[PDB]
């Protein structure tokens, strides 16, 4: 969400990110091809 808090020490390269729907939306742009 664009905050300036630095990640904790238990963090391992795990990216859980919201806004997955937009990514789907961005590629579902197609009219003939895969949605």
């Amino acid at each position: 969400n664009r905050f300036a808090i630095m990640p904790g020490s238990r963090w391992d390269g795990v990216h859980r990110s919201n806004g997955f729907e937009e990514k789907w939306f961005a590629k579902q742009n197609e009219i003939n091809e895969k949605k």
Partner: protein, 89 residues
């Protein structure tokens, strides 16, 4: 005011295979977790479908709640909500 209980959250819709370590790692990208309680049923030995984690920083809670709520982990959509949780030791 930093010393509020607004650093505490409620996590619901836990997967039976999710333990404190999973939560801690994930929750660590949103900030610094200080304590986590995985509610696990003594009978089954598995997660009760809910857990708790508190951050060192209140902003971290909103970062986690808004991003994790509705997010699918383990094939299930996590539910995060702000709550004042007080642990029992």
């Amino acid at each position: 005011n930093e010393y509020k209980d607004n650093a505490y959250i409620y996590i619901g819709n836990l997967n039976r295979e999710l333990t404190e370590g999973d939560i801690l790692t994930v929750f660590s990208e949103y900030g610094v977790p200080v304590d986590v309680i995985l509610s696990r049923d003594e009978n089954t030995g598995e997660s009760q479908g809910f857990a708790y984690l508190k951050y060192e920083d209140q902003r971290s809670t909103i970062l986690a709640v808004d991003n994790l709520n509705g997010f699918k982990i383990g094939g299930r959509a996590l539910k995060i909500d702000h709550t004042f949780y007080r642990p029992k030791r």
